[model samples]
Target chain A: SLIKVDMRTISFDIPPQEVLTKDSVTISVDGVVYYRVQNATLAVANITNADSATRLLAQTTLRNALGTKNLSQILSDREEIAHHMQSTLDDATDDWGIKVERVEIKDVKLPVQ
Target chain B: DSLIKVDMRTISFDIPPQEVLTKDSVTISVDGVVYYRVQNATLAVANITNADSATRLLAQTTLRNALGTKNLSQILSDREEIAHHMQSTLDDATDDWGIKVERVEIKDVKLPV
Candidate 1:
């Protein structure tokens, strides 16, 4: 069943300066399985530093992808777009020695008609 | 510098309740753990995995030290606590030898009504 995709607005409550490096984060969904980076530092540096529009676009794309994914799919292949974001953040934070212990695509929102 | 153990486990929760099944209790009521010190032979059943030689030996010793003379509630609670303690013991013991405990099993126990 194909569902409609709209310009849905979502909010992510990330900790301020808490760090999101590759090595530190472990991404999880439904609070069951977790995917942590082997190593890397700084948190979300590259993604955070990008143009506001680009970042927003990336966030939107991520929300769309995350919305479509089932729990099984999320559990099986962890390297979804959110994973790339974590990885990108890891690369950006290589010098900071900050690892993202977990990156949880907590929730996605779709516009209710 | 010494180790000792006692194996005194009685099956509980195995037999069916009175008047529930009514017909053939013998077929279903025999839920007991079969003891084995087989030569290079291993088997596994439910709720947990099978224990290897070292773990089986240590667990036997540990159980021998325990006093399973308690009411139903106490027995159930003690079993849960024992399981947690067993895991802790295995973790601490296996660190030095490098040989891991693959699995563990809690055999049958009888509850006094």
Candidate 2:
């Protein structure tokens, strides 16, 4: 059966992070961030394929940038990488008539022994 | 087998009329066409007894390649002729799995004059 189209858009802010600087009046950053978009499907699909593999890929991608930094830096920067990927994907998918509504990095895990 | 209670889901897909050749290209036949192509998919799982359940749920995200191309307005004009029939179809097809389609939405109907 054919039905009328009803679509809506939703967005969420990305968390703020601390920037690496020699010194500042007060070196601290705080805020909650989230990824909200159609990208959730990809996250599920990627994790479905394999959990650790997906996490490892994300970790490796940020490994170089965060060599001397901590988890907070890695967490915030991950959104930047995700946005870049989504923008590129959106461009590619346009020709195919596939629209990626959103892209989000659901969670991050730290390596533990 | 595990007992799983899947929460309500809102699945949406954007149907770009690009692939759909309207008017001159849209062939018509006495048999008619009932095409169902998945343009975009969104699934938000509230609770999962096992993540593996994602595989089966995602599987339902399908393109009914079997359906042929037919006039959208025709199908929609008569709820009994179109939407009602499809609802009945889903009733049988997904009944065994205990999966209920909260809503099956169709978006962006492109018609050429």
Reference contacts preserved by each model: 0.00, 0.00
Q: What overall lDDT goes with each candidate model?
A: 0.33, 0.34
List the candidate 2 regions with Cα displacement exceeding 4 Å. A1-113, B1-5, B8-73, B79-81
What lDDT score goes with residue B28 in model 1? 14
- The DockQ figures for the candidates are 0.01, 0.05
Give per-residue lDDT, candidate 2, residue A109.
30
Each candidate structure's TM-score, on Cα atoms with residue i matched to residue i, is 0.23, 0.25
lDDT of 2 by residue, B1-113 (tens): 10111123333333223333323345321112223322221222222233224323332322122123335355345434443454456444444434444334343344444
Q: By summed lDDT, which 10 consecutive residues of candidate 1 chain A come out lowest?
A: A1-10
Please give, as one word, the docking class of candidate 1: incorrect
Task: State each candidate's clash count.
Answer: 23, 10
lDDT of 1 by residue, B1-113 (tens): 00001111221111122111112221111112212221221121110122334444554444433323233344346666655554456545543433333333355543332
Model 2 residue pairs with clashes: A1-B82, A1-B83, A15-A33, A37-A102, A38-A102, A39-A102, B33-B68, B34-B67, B34-B68, B35-B68
Q: Where's the lowest-lDDT run of ten residues in candidate 2 chain B?
A: B1-10
